[PDB]
Amino acid sequence: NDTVLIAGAGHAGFQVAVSLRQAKYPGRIALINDEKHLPYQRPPLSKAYLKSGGDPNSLMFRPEKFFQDQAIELISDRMVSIDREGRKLLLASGTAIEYGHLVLATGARNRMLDVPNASLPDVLYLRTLDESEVLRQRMPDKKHVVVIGAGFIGLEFAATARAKGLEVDVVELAPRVMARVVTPEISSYFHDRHSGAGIRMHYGVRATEIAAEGDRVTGVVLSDGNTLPCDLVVVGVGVIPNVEIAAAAGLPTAAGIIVDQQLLTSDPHISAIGDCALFESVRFGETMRVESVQNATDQARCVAARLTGDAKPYDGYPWFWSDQGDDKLQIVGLTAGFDQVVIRGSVAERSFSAFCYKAGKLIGIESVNRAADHVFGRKILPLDKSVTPEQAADLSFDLKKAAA
């Protein structure tokens, strides 16, 4: 067959469809979308949107007419099974489709809070437009929310809930916030900023039970035995890559759908991109899964480029960002295994960067309200070039000249 079937119409799904057309792909392109919304943006969900008037499709990538003009078949359905041998995609509507090449961009789903009463009505998640909209409408009728999970999303939400007048308590099991993604100097800064806004941070604890009265949430019980009163709970304790269906078809999976340097599964005719993909990284010499718009986007481009001619190893350089309250956090590079951190700028001035090193080499830059340092990293890191810790701290050391 000639048709390219895309399962999942989020960032990666939408981008591969678009990039496929830009590259003048002749075949048919079907985009399976299991949500009652035109493909939309995720980043605004825990940011601006929570502050908007809730405009139905204000987060749409492109308007409805776009998919028609682009010959991208937008199918309002969901894949449930994959017939690799018959190269057919089995939808839930009962329908079935043959494919030349199958692109899996199923992303990842919320990991359910595994605690008593965790499923009461007032225990909400925050990852889909729908979930964002209910939370937006629910906050005005709530006085106190406990946020479980100090990840990016949880804090982006916490600041807004606080800004709206709600009482806010953040529950994190680790000793500091964003422990899975940033170095201590960043956690510290944000701990101060949020605390300063009146948000009460709680470290070293897990939720062990959701205290309720009738079926009304009244608090969150912690592993230290104490209970934090609240009438609303927002949980962000991780996701689960959607690999089930692919695994059901015999495709290797783990913490994501396994793919090689070219984002291909063990079955040619089937690729995996975005949050759902556990790819082989030539640059970093290891298999990993990355959750970011950058990753979804660059991976989509890589596949689109392959299915149209030049098959190259995926090498989208990783970078992320987060908008918490009035502060902007930008990260370029992977900081895992950092053994030396240098501060450039001033924490007091609320504009600085943490230059992270490992074995004497710059591995990443975490910039708070300092776009210039981020541009420096985005240019230098992909080239695998570095700057000494001494130079990073020196405000008289010109980053523009260094990156020319």
Residues in binding site for FAD:
11-12, 34-35, 42, 47, 79, 275, 293
Are residues 222 and 228 in contact, defined by beta-carbon separation less than 8 angstroms?
yes
User: 167: how many CB neighbours lie within 10 A of its CB?
Assistant: 18
Single out the residue of 122, 167, 172, 291 in contact with ligand FAD (rule: CB under 6 A): 291
Q: Is 219 or 274 the residue whose CB approaches ligand FAD more closely?
A: 274
- DSSP label at residue 94: S
Q: How far is the CB of 298 from ligand FAD (least distance, A)?
A: 11
Report the SS3 class of residue 367: strand
Site membership for ligand FAD, residue 328 (CB under 6 A): no
Of the candidates 371, 373, 366, 370, the residue with the CA atom closest to the CA atom of residue 391: 373
Site membership for ligand FAD, residue 331 (CB under 6 A): no
| Alpha-carbon gap, residue 127 to 110, rounded angstroms | 7
Q: Is 126 or 221 the residue whose CB approaches ligand FAD more closely?
A: 126
| Alpha-carbon gap, residue 349 to 172, rounded angstroms | 27
What is the chain's percent helix, strand, coil content, to nearest 5?
25, 30, 45
- Residue 154-193 contact track with ligand FAD, rule CB under 6 A, x = bound: ----------------------------------------
Q: Is 117 or 156 the residue whose CB approaches ligand FAD more closely?
A: 156
Are residues 25 and 6 in contact, defined by beta-carbon separation less than 8 angstroms?
no
Q: How far is the CB of 178 from ligand FAD (least distance, A)?
A: 13
Single out the residue of 13, 219, 316, 377 in contact with ligand FAD (rule: CB under 6 A): 13
Single out the residue of 18, 31, 38, 46 in contact with ligand FAD (rule: CB under 6 A): 46
| Alpha-carbon gap, residue 290 to 378, rounded angstroms | 17
Site membership for ligand FAD, residue 274 (CB under 6 A): yes
Q: How far is the CB of 344 from ligand FAD (least distance, A)?
A: 23
Beta carbons within 8 Å of 12's beta carbon, 6+ residues apart: 105, 107, 273, 274, 275, 296, 297, 299, 300
Interacting residue ranges for ligand FAD, rule: CB under 6 A: 7-13, 32, 34-35, 42-43, 45-46, 78-79, 105-107, 126-127, 153, 242, 245, 274-276, 291-294, 296, 320-322
